[PDB]
Amino acid sequence: NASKTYPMAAGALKKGGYVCINGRPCKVIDLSVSKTGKHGHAKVSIVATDIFTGNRLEDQAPSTHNVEVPFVKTFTYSVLDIQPNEDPSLPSHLSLMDDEGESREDLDMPPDAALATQIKEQFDSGKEVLVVVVSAMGTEQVLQTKNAA
């Protein structure tokens, strides 16, 4: 077993939900449904945003057709250090801590510009920075940031 999606009827999709298009894990941002066919058979039109790249994707499928929905995991870390890459122009390294006392250094900063500035600014200010790491389809990225009280 290495399977990272599950089956769902296209007609069961809602704005806000996850879907694979082009083998990419997406959140549905627009949903359109045609009336019927000749046998109650309707066509579903999906516009979804890639959760990692931010890219617009489009997909149509019959309502009875079973799309794949990605399993999405979410883990929250505290940031211990930010270290610049050896190559100044590449994304910075992150040193992170989970709630069990284990660090990990294997994750970098996100491709999101505005998100990577926000993390650097917050850390620099002396607040405890909490990054949210979302995983799906083998890819792991930082997608959110907040602080503790």
mmCIF file of N, CA, C and O in Angstrom, residues 47-146:
data_model
loop_
_atom_site.group_PDB
_atom_site.id
_atom_site.type_symbol
_atom_site.label_atom_id
_atom_site.label_comp_id
_atom_site.label_asym_id
_atom_site.label_seq_id
_atom_site.Cartn_x
_atom_site.Cartn_y
_atom_site.Cartn_z
ATOM 1 N N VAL A 47 -13.149 24.275 -11.358
ATOM 2 C CA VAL A 47 -11.950 25.130 -11.392
ATOM 3 C C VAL A 47 -11.315 24.985 -10.035
ATOM 4 O O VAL A 47 -11.965 25.279 -9.009
ATOM 5 N N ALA A 48 -10.068 24.522 -10.007
ATOM 6 C CA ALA A 48 -9.376 24.393 -8.721
ATOM 7 C C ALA A 48 -7.966 25.018 -8.701
ATOM 8 O O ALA A 48 -7.309 25.143 -9.756
ATOM 9 N N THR A 49 -7.540 25.442 -7.501
ATOM 10 C CA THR A 49 -6.234 26.018 -7.306
ATOM 11 C C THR A 49 -5.289 25.001 -6.682
ATOM 12 O O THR A 49 -5.621 24.347 -5.714
ATOM 13 N N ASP A 50 -4.106 24.854 -7.248
ATOM 14 C CA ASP A 50 -3.114 23.939 -6.683
ATOM 15 C C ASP A 50 -2.668 24.444 -5.310
ATOM 16 O O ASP A 50 -2.292 25.610 -5.175
ATOM 17 N N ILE A 51 -2.689 23.589 -4.296
ATOM 18 C CA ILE A 51 -2.435 24.056 -2.916
ATOM 19 C C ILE A 51 -0.968 24.388 -2.646
ATOM 20 O O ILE A 51 -0.611 25.160 -1.715
ATOM 21 N N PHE A 52 -0.109 23.810 -3.476
ATOM 22 C CA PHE A 52 1.320 24.044 -3.323
ATOM 23 C C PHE A 52 1.903 25.099 -4.274
ATOM 24 O O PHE A 52 2.664 25.969 -3.815
ATOM 25 N N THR A 53 1.539 25.035 -5.564
ATOM 26 C CA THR A 53 1.985 26.012 -6.572
ATOM 27 C C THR A 53 1.096 27.244 -6.788
ATOM 28 O O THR A 53 1.557 28.254 -7.305
ATOM 29 N N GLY A 54 -0.166 27.194 -6.411
ATOM 30 C CA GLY A 54 -1.006 28.365 -6.588
ATOM 31 C C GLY A 54 -1.570 28.449 -7.996
ATOM 32 O O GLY A 54 -2.220 29.429 -8.307
ATOM 33 N N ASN A 55 -1.375 27.397 -8.806
ATOM 34 C CA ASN A 55 -1.691 27.361 -10.251
ATOM 35 C C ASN A 55 -3.176 27.067 -10.526
ATOM 36 O O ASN A 55 -3.752 26.219 -9.875
ATOM 37 N N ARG A 56 -3.796 27.753 -11.488
ATOM 38 C CA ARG A 56 -5.193 27.469 -11.844
ATOM 39 C C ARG A 56 -5.272 26.219 -12.714
ATOM 40 O O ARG A 56 -4.587 26.127 -13.750
ATOM 41 N N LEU A 57 -6.098 25.259 -12.297
ATOM 42 C CA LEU A 57 -6.404 24.097 -13.141
ATOM 43 C C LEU A 57 -7.895 23.921 -13.393
ATOM 44 O O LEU A 57 -8.724 24.338 -12.583
ATOM 45 N N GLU A 58 -8.225 23.320 -14.534
ATOM 46 C CA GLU A 58 -9.611 23.092 -14.939
ATOM 47 C C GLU A 58 -9.838 21.588 -15.219
ATOM 48 O O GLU A 58 -8.958 20.912 -15.773
ATOM 49 N N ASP A 59 -11.003 21.075 -14.816
ATOM 50 C CA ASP A 59 -11.394 19.686 -15.074
ATOM 51 C C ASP A 59 -12.908 19.513 -15.254
ATOM 52 O O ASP A 59 -13.691 20.098 -14.529
ATOM 53 N N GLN A 60 -13.312 18.734 -16.258
ATOM 54 C CA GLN A 60 -14.711 18.304 -16.366
ATOM 55 C C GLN A 60 -14.756 16.792 -16.244
ATOM 56 O O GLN A 60 -13.809 16.134 -16.609
ATOM 57 N N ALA A 61 -15.861 16.290 -15.698
ATOM 58 C CA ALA A 61 -16.154 14.876 -15.507
ATOM 59 C C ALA A 61 -17.659 14.698 -15.373
ATOM 60 O O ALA A 61 -18.307 15.518 -14.738
ATOM 61 N N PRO A 62 -18.208 13.611 -15.909
ATOM 62 C CA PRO A 62 -19.569 13.159 -15.543
ATOM 63 C C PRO A 62 -19.760 13.038 -14.031
ATOM 64 O O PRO A 62 -18.819 12.714 -13.295
ATOM 65 N N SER A 63 -20.985 13.266 -13.564
ATOM 66 C CA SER A 63 -21.242 13.215 -12.120
ATOM 67 C C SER A 63 -21.021 11.841 -11.471
ATOM 68 O O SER A 63 -20.757 11.782 -10.260
ATOM 69 N N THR A 64 -21.134 10.762 -12.255
ATOM 70 C CA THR A 64 -21.021 9.402 -11.717
ATOM 71 C C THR A 64 -19.603 8.930 -11.773
ATOM 72 O O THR A 64 -19.283 7.912 -11.168
ATOM 73 N N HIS A 65 -18.770 9.658 -12.518
ATOM 74 C CA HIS A 65 -17.355 9.399 -12.601
ATOM 75 C C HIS A 65 -16.671 9.671 -11.253
ATOM 76 O O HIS A 65 -16.940 10.706 -10.581
ATOM 77 N N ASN A 66 -15.806 8.730 -10.845
ATOM 78 C CA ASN A 66 -15.119 8.829 -9.561
ATOM 79 C C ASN A 66 -13.741 9.494 -9.675
ATOM 80 O O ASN A 66 -12.774 8.878 -10.149
ATOM 81 N N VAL A 67 -13.672 10.759 -9.252
ATOM 82 C CA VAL A 67 -12.420 11.480 -9.125
ATOM 83 C C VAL A 67 -11.592 10.950 -7.951
ATOM 84 O O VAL A 67 -12.102 10.172 -7.059
ATOM 85 N N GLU A 68 -10.313 11.334 -7.938
ATOM 86 C CA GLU A 68 -9.459 11.002 -6.792
ATOM 87 C C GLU A 68 -9.414 12.257 -5.948
ATOM 88 O O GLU A 68 -9.345 13.372 -6.486
ATOM 89 N N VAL A 69 -9.539 12.078 -4.641
ATOM 90 C CA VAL A 69 -9.352 13.162 -3.691
ATOM 91 C C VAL A 69 -8.084 12.876 -2.899
ATOM 92 O O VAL A 69 -7.915 11.768 -2.385
ATOM 93 N N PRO A 70 -7.188 13.847 -2.819
ATOM 94 C CA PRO A 70 -5.948 13.669 -2.067
ATOM 95 C C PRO A 70 -6.171 13.548 -0.520
ATOM 96 O O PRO A 70 -7.028 14.266 0.006
ATOM 97 N N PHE A 71 -5.456 12.659 0.183
ATOM 98 C CA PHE A 71 -5.378 12.767 1.663
ATOM 99 C C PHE A 71 -4.478 13.947 1.934
ATOM 100 O O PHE A 71 -3.366 14.008 1.416
ATOM 101 N N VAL A 72 -4.977 14.910 2.698
ATOM 102 C CA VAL A 72 -4.180 16.069 3.111
ATOM 103 C C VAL A 72 -3.899 15.964 4.603
ATOM 104 O O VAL A 72 -4.846 15.891 5.392
ATOM 105 N N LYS A 73 -2.614 15.911 4.983
ATOM 106 C CA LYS A 73 -2.215 16.006 6.399
ATOM 107 C C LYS A 73 -1.744 17.407 6.790
ATOM 108 O O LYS A 73 -1.305 18.169 5.952
ATOM 109 N N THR A 74 -1.855 17.736 8.074
ATOM 110 C CA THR A 74 -1.433 19.038 8.599
ATOM 111 C C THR A 74 -0.708 18.901 9.928
ATOM 112 O O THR A 74 -1.239 18.374 10.901
ATOM 113 N N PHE A 75 0.516 19.399 9.964
ATOM 114 C CA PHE A 75 1.327 19.362 11.171
ATOM 115 C C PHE A 75 1.813 20.782 11.467
ATOM 116 O O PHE A 75 2.198 21.506 10.550
ATOM 117 N N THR A 76 1.771 21.179 12.738
ATOM 118 C CA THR A 76 2.242 22.502 13.177
ATOM 119 C C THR A 76 3.591 22.412 13.910
ATOM 120 O O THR A 76 3.784 21.547 14.787
ATOM 121 N N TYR A 77 4.523 23.293 13.515
ATOM 122 C CA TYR A 77 5.884 23.359 14.089
ATOM 123 C C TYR A 77 6.160 24.740 14.675
ATOM 124 O O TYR A 77 5.520 25.706 14.266
ATOM 125 N N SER A 78 7.089 24.823 15.635
ATOM 126 C CA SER A 78 7.640 26.105 16.146
ATOM 127 C C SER A 78 8.992 26.325 15.422
ATOM 128 O O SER A 78 9.744 25.358 15.185
ATOM 129 N N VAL A 79 9.303 27.559 15.039
ATOM 130 C CA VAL A 79 10.570 27.825 14.334
ATOM 131 C C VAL A 79 11.674 28.174 15.333
ATOM 132 O O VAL A 79 11.534 29.092 16.156
ATOM 133 N N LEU A 80 12.775 27.429 15.246
ATOM 134 C CA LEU A 80 13.941 27.555 16.130
ATOM 135 C C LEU A 80 15.048 28.481 15.545
ATOM 136 O O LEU A 80 15.747 29.185 16.279
ATOM 137 N N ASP A 81 15.207 28.455 14.221
ATOM 138 C CA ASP A 81 16.240 29.188 13.519
ATOM 139 C C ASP A 81 15.809 29.240 12.054
ATOM 140 O O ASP A 81 15.065 28.359 11.589
ATOM 141 N N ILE A 82 16.269 30.294 11.366
ATOM 142 C CA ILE A 82 16.230 30.420 9.913
ATOM 143 C C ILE A 82 17.675 30.598 9.436
ATOM 144 O O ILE A 82 18.349 31.513 9.868
ATOM 145 N N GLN A 83 18.170 29.728 8.564
ATOM 146 C CA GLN A 83 19.550 29.903 8.054
ATOM 147 C C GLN A 83 19.578 30.054 6.535
ATOM 148 O O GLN A 83 19.048 29.203 5.845
ATOM 149 N N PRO A 84 20.193 31.120 6.020
ATOM 150 C CA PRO A 84 20.318 31.323 4.561
ATOM 151 C C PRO A 84 21.003 30.150 3.828
ATOM 152 O O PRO A 84 21.903 29.510 4.389
ATOM 153 N N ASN A 85 20.580 29.872 2.596
ATOM 154 C CA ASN A 85 21.244 28.846 1.816
ATOM 155 C C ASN A 85 22.686 29.241 1.503
ATOM 156 O O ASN A 85 23.022 30.436 1.493
ATOM 157 N N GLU A 86 23.533 28.237 1.251
ATOM 158 C CA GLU A 86 24.903 28.442 0.791
ATOM 159 C C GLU A 86 24.908 29.327 -0.455
ATOM 160 O O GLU A 86 25.780 30.181 -0.628
ATOM 161 N N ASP A 87 23.931 29.108 -1.328
ATOM 162 C CA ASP A 87 23.738 29.958 -2.491
ATOM 163 C C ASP A 87 22.726 31.052 -2.150
ATOM 164 O O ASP A 87 21.528 30.760 -2.085
ATOM 165 N N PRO A 88 23.183 32.295 -1.937
ATOM 166 C CA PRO A 88 22.288 33.385 -1.517
ATOM 167 C C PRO A 88 20.934 33.417 -2.239
ATOM 168 O O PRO A 88 19.936 33.639 -1.556
ATOM 169 N N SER A 89 20.888 33.147 -3.545
ATOM 170 C CA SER A 89 19.637 33.223 -4.332
ATOM 171 C C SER A 89 18.588 32.077 -4.205
ATOM 172 O O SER A 89 17.510 32.168 -4.796
ATOM 173 N N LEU A 90 18.926 31.011 -3.475
ATOM 174 C CA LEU A 90 18.045 29.855 -3.224
ATOM 175 C C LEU A 90 17.286 30.038 -1.867
ATOM 176 O O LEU A 90 17.777 30.774 -0.982
ATOM 177 N N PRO A 91 16.116 29.385 -1.690
ATOM 178 C CA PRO A 91 15.326 29.524 -0.446
ATOM 179 C C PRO A 91 16.057 29.104 0.839
ATOM 180 O O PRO A 91 16.819 28.124 0.818
ATOM 181 N N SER A 92 15.835 29.857 1.922
ATOM 182 C CA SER A 92 16.484 29.632 3.240
ATOM 183 C C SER A 92 16.052 28.354 3.918
ATOM 184 O O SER A 92 14.957 27.856 3.653
ATOM 185 N N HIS A 93 16.915 27.820 4.780
ATOM 186 C CA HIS A 93 16.621 26.585 5.531
ATOM 187 C C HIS A 93 15.822 26.877 6.792
ATOM 188 O O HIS A 93 15.982 27.880 7.415
ATOM 189 N N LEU A 94 14.951 25.979 7.177
ATOM 190 C CA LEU A 94 14.237 26.140 8.437
ATOM 191 C C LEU A 94 14.655 25.059 9.424
ATOM 192 O O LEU A 94 14.850 23.901 9.033
ATOM 193 N N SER A 95 14.812 25.469 10.680
ATOM 194 C CA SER A 95 14.919 24.576 11.819
ATOM 195 C C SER A 95 13.621 24.611 12.668
ATOM 196 O O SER A 95 13.265 25.650 13.212
ATOM 197 N N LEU A 96 12.924 23.480 12.761
ATOM 198 C CA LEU A 96 11.564 23.417 13.297
ATOM 199 C C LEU A 96 11.397 22.401 14.429
ATOM 200 O O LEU A 96 12.150 21.447 14.521
ATOM 201 N N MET A 97 10.379 22.590 15.260
ATOM 202 C CA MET A 97 10.159 21.811 16.482
ATOM 203 C C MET A 97 8.713 21.414 16.458
ATOM 204 O O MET A 97 7.877 22.250 16.167
ATOM 205 N N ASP A 98 8.414 20.144 16.707
ATOM 206 C CA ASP A 98 7.035 19.690 16.882
ATOM 207 C C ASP A 98 6.625 19.723 18.368
ATOM 208 O O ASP A 98 7.407 20.099 19.206
ATOM 209 N N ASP A 99 5.408 19.311 18.700
ATOM 210 C CA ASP A 99 4.910 19.409 20.088
ATOM 211 C C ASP A 99 5.452 18.326 21.024
ATOM 212 O O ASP A 99 5.154 18.357 22.227
ATOM 213 N N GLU A 100 6.231 17.384 20.474
ATOM 214 C CA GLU A 100 6.771 16.240 21.217
ATOM 215 C C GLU A 100 8.256 16.430 21.553
ATOM 216 O O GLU A 100 8.863 15.587 22.176
ATOM 217 N N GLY A 101 8.840 17.538 21.117
ATOM 218 C CA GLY A 101 10.219 17.870 21.436
ATOM 219 C C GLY A 101 11.268 17.451 20.414
ATOM 220 O O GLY A 101 12.454 17.463 20.750
ATOM 221 N N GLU A 102 10.836 17.090 19.192
ATOM 222 C CA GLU A 102 11.714 16.623 18.105
ATOM 223 C C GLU A 102 11.849 17.680 17.025
ATOM 224 O O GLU A 102 10.853 18.194 16.506
ATOM 225 N N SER A 103 13.085 17.992 16.663
ATOM 226 C CA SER A 103 13.319 18.963 15.606
ATOM 227 C C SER A 103 13.476 18.300 14.259
ATOM 228 O O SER A 103 13.841 17.125 14.151
ATOM 229 N N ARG A 104 13.221 19.072 13.219
ATOM 230 C CA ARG A 104 13.590 18.623 11.889
ATOM 231 C C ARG A 104 14.146 19.779 11.061
ATOM 232 O O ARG A 104 13.634 20.880 11.120
ATOM 233 N N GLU A 105 15.196 19.493 10.297
ATOM 234 C CA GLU A 105 15.950 20.467 9.514
ATOM 235 C C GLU A 105 15.803 20.251 8.016
ATOM 236 O O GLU A 105 16.510 20.877 7.233
ATOM 237 N N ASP A 106 14.939 19.341 7.600
ATOM 238 C CA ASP A 106 14.973 18.908 6.222
ATOM 239 C C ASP A 106 14.125 19.844 5.335
ATOM 240 O O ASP A 106 14.246 19.819 4.111
ATOM 241 N N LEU A 107 13.300 20.679 5.974
ATOM 242 C CA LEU A 107 12.364 21.580 5.288
ATOM 243 C C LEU A 107 12.892 22.967 5.121
ATOM 244 O O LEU A 107 13.542 23.525 6.005
ATOM 245 N N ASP A 108 12.563 23.533 3.980
ATOM 246 C CA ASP A 108 13.061 24.833 3.575
ATOM 247 C C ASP A 108 11.979 25.913 3.708
ATOM 248 O O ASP A 108 10.860 25.676 4.162
ATOM 249 N N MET A 109 12.285 27.117 3.292
ATOM 250 C CA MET A 109 11.191 28.060 3.181
ATOM 251 C C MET A 109 10.302 27.823 1.936
ATOM 252 O O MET A 109 10.731 27.223 0.917
ATOM 253 N N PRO A 110 9.052 28.265 2.059
ATOM 254 C CA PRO A 110 8.058 28.118 0.999
ATOM 255 C C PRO A 110 8.438 28.907 -0.273
ATOM 256 O O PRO A 110 9.200 29.882 -0.178
ATOM 257 N N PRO A 111 7.926 28.500 -1.439
ATOM 258 C CA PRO A 111 8.099 29.289 -2.659
ATOM 259 C C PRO A 111 7.337 30.647 -2.629
ATOM 260 O O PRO A 111 7.725 31.582 -3.358
ATOM 261 N N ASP A 112 6.280 30.745 -1.815
ATOM 262 C CA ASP A 112 5.525 31.993 -1.594
ATOM 263 C C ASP A 112 6.446 33.111 -1.066
ATOM 264 O O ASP A 112 7.035 32.970 0.005
ATOM 265 N N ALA A 113 6.560 34.211 -1.805
ATOM 266 C CA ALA A 113 7.414 35.328 -1.398
ATOM 267 C C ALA A 113 6.922 35.970 -0.099
ATOM 268 O O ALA A 113 7.635 35.984 0.921
ATOM 269 N N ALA A 114 5.688 36.477 -0.164
ATOM 270 C CA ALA A 114 5.009 37.156 0.940
ATOM 271 C C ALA A 114 4.925 36.304 2.197
ATOM 272 O O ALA A 114 4.983 36.849 3.307
ATOM 273 N N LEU A 115 4.773 34.983 2.027
ATOM 274 C CA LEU A 115 4.773 34.080 3.171
ATOM 275 C C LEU A 115 6.176 33.920 3.830
ATOM 276 O O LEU A 115 6.293 33.918 5.050
ATOM 277 N N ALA A 116 7.226 33.816 3.018
ATOM 278 C CA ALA A 116 8.589 33.744 3.530
ATOM 279 C C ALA A 116 9.084 35.056 4.191
ATOM 280 O O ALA A 116 9.858 35.000 5.145
ATOM 281 N N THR A 117 8.646 36.218 3.698
ATOM 282 C CA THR A 117 8.927 37.496 4.374
ATOM 283 C C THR A 117 8.235 37.599 5.746
ATOM 284 O O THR A 117 8.821 38.107 6.732
ATOM 285 N N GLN A 118 6.991 37.128 5.799
ATOM 286 C CA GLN A 118 6.202 37.209 7.013
ATOM 287 C C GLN A 118 6.825 36.369 8.105
ATOM 288 O O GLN A 118 6.865 36.789 9.283
ATOM 289 N N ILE A 119 7.340 35.200 7.723
ATOM 290 C CA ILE A 119 7.981 34.329 8.700
ATOM 291 C C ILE A 119 9.261 34.973 9.217
ATOM 292 O O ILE A 119 9.421 35.128 10.426
ATOM 293 N N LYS A 120 10.127 35.416 8.309
ATOM 294 C CA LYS A 120 11.339 36.119 8.711
ATOM 295 C C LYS A 120 11.103 37.337 9.603
ATOM 296 O O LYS A 120 11.823 37.551 10.575
ATOM 297 N N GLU A 121 10.092 38.129 9.264
ATOM 298 C CA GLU A 121 9.777 39.317 10.046
ATOM 299 C C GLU A 121 9.334 38.944 11.460
ATOM 300 O O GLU A 121 9.800 39.530 12.443
ATOM 301 N N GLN A 122 8.462 37.942 11.556
ATOM 302 C CA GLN A 122 7.882 37.588 12.843
ATOM 303 C C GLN A 122 8.934 37.034 13.792
ATOM 304 O O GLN A 122 8.971 37.422 14.969
ATOM 305 N N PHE A 123 9.788 36.153 13.253
ATOM 306 C CA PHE A 123 10.876 35.521 13.983
ATOM 307 C C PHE A 123 11.835 36.559 14.470
ATOM 308 O O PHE A 123 12.217 36.554 15.658
ATOM 309 N N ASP A 124 12.206 37.458 13.549
ATOM 310 C CA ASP A 124 13.065 38.593 13.875
ATOM 311 C C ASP A 124 12.487 39.477 14.936
ATOM 312 O O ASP A 124 13.237 40.081 15.659
ATOM 313 N N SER A 125 11.168 39.549 15.057
ATOM 314 C CA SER A 125 10.611 40.452 16.052
ATOM 315 C C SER A 125 10.692 39.860 17.464
ATOM 316 O O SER A 125 10.726 40.593 18.455
ATOM 317 N N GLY A 126 10.808 38.544 17.558
ATOM 318 C CA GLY A 126 11.017 37.921 18.854
ATOM 319 C C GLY A 126 9.783 37.184 19.349
ATOM 320 O O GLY A 126 9.806 36.595 20.426
ATOM 321 N N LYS A 127 8.705 37.225 18.569
ATOM 322 C CA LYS A 127 7.544 36.365 18.800
ATOM 323 C C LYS A 127 7.921 34.922 18.504
ATOM 324 O O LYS A 127 8.857 34.670 17.732
ATOM 325 N N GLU A 128 7.232 33.977 19.146
ATOM 326 C CA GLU A 128 7.348 32.589 18.734
ATOM 327 C C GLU A 128 6.557 32.367 17.457
ATOM 328 O O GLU A 128 5.338 32.573 17.446
ATOM 329 N N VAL A 129 7.229 31.934 16.396
ATOM 330 C CA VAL A 129 6.555 31.708 15.113
ATOM 331 C C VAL A 129 6.118 30.252 14.938
ATOM 332 O O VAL A 129 6.909 29.343 15.108
ATOM 333 N N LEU A 130 4.849 30.047 14.604
ATOM 334 C CA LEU A 130 4.340 28.720 14.301
ATOM 335 C C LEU A 130 3.987 28.610 12.823
ATOM 336 O O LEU A 130 3.078 29.274 12.336
ATOM 337 N N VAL A 131 4.714 27.747 12.129
ATOM 338 C CA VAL A 131 4.400 27.360 10.757
ATOM 339 C C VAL A 131 3.540 26.077 10.639
ATOM 340 O O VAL A 131 3.694 25.115 11.414
ATOM 341 N N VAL A 132 2.628 26.086 9.673
ATOM 342 C CA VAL A 132 1.749 24.969 9.408
ATOM 343 C C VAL A 132 2.294 24.293 8.150
ATOM 344 O O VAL A 132 2.386 24.914 7.098
ATOM 345 N N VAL A 133 2.664 23.026 8.282
ATOM 346 C CA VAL A 133 3.157 22.217 7.184
ATOM 347 C C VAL A 133 2.031 21.294 6.678
ATOM 348 O O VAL A 133 1.466 20.487 7.433
ATOM 349 N N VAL A 134 1.690 21.465 5.402
ATOM 350 C CA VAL A 134 0.670 20.670 4.749
ATOM 351 C C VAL A 134 1.408 19.702 3.845
ATOM 352 O O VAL A 134 2.380 20.066 3.174
ATOM 353 N N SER A 135 0.957 18.457 3.887
ATOM 354 C CA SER A 135 1.498 17.376 3.087
ATOM 355 C C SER A 135 0.383 16.806 2.179
ATOM 356 O O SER A 135 -0.772 16.742 2.588
ATOM 357 N N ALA A 136 0.723 16.411 0.953
ATOM 358 C CA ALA A 136 -0.213 15.727 0.059
ATOM 359 C C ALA A 136 0.554 15.267 -1.130
ATOM 360 O O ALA A 136 1.295 16.037 -1.735
ATOM 361 N N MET A 137 0.374 14.013 -1.490
ATOM 362 C CA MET A 137 0.942 13.520 -2.713
ATOM 363 C C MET A 137 2.475 13.524 -2.727
ATOM 364 O O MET A 137 3.091 13.674 -3.774
ATOM 365 N N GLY A 138 3.097 13.352 -1.570
ATOM 366 C CA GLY A 138 4.535 13.256 -1.530
ATOM 367 C C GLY A 138 5.198 14.571 -1.246
ATOM 368 O O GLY A 138 6.180 14.582 -0.498
ATOM 369 N N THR A 139 4.661 15.657 -1.824
ATOM 370 C CA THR A 139 5.047 17.063 -1.545
ATOM 371 C C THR A 139 4.719 17.563 -0.130
ATOM 372 O O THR A 139 3.620 17.402 0.336
ATOM 373 N N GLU A 140 5.688 18.183 0.532
ATOM 374 C CA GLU A 140 5.484 18.874 1.820
ATOM 375 C C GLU A 140 5.898 20.384 1.767
ATOM 376 O O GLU A 140 7.067 20.726 1.572
ATOM 377 N N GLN A 141 4.954 21.277 2.027
ATOM 378 C CA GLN A 141 5.240 22.706 2.059
ATOM 379 C C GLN A 141 4.677 23.373 3.302
ATOM 380 O O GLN A 141 3.731 22.873 3.895
ATOM 381 N N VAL A 142 5.251 24.520 3.658
ATOM 382 C CA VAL A 142 4.658 25.453 4.638
ATOM 383 C C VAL A 142 3.616 26.319 3.935
ATOM 384 O O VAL A 142 3.931 26.973 2.927
ATOM 385 N N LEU A 143 2.396 26.339 4.463
ATOM 386 C CA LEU A 143 1.286 27.067 3.823
ATOM 387 C C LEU A 143 0.655 28.159 4.681
ATOM 388 O O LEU A 143 -0.058 29.053 4.188
ATOM 389 N N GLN A 144 0.903 28.073 5.976
ATOM 390 C CA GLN A 144 0.307 29.036 6.889
ATOM 391 C C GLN A 144 1.336 29.533 7.895
ATOM 392 O O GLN A 144 2.320 28.856 8.146
ATOM 393 N N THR A 145 1.130 30.727 8.440
ATOM 394 C CA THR A 145 1.860 31.134 9.672
ATOM 395 C C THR A 145 1.011 31.842 10.755
ATOM 396 O O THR A 145 0.062 32.589 10.427
ATOM 397 N N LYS A 146 1.318 31.555 12.026
ATOM 398 C CA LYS A 146 0.683 32.228 13.202
ATOM 399 C C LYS A 146 1.656 32.287 14.412
ATOM 400 O O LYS A 146 2.802 31.797 14.297
#
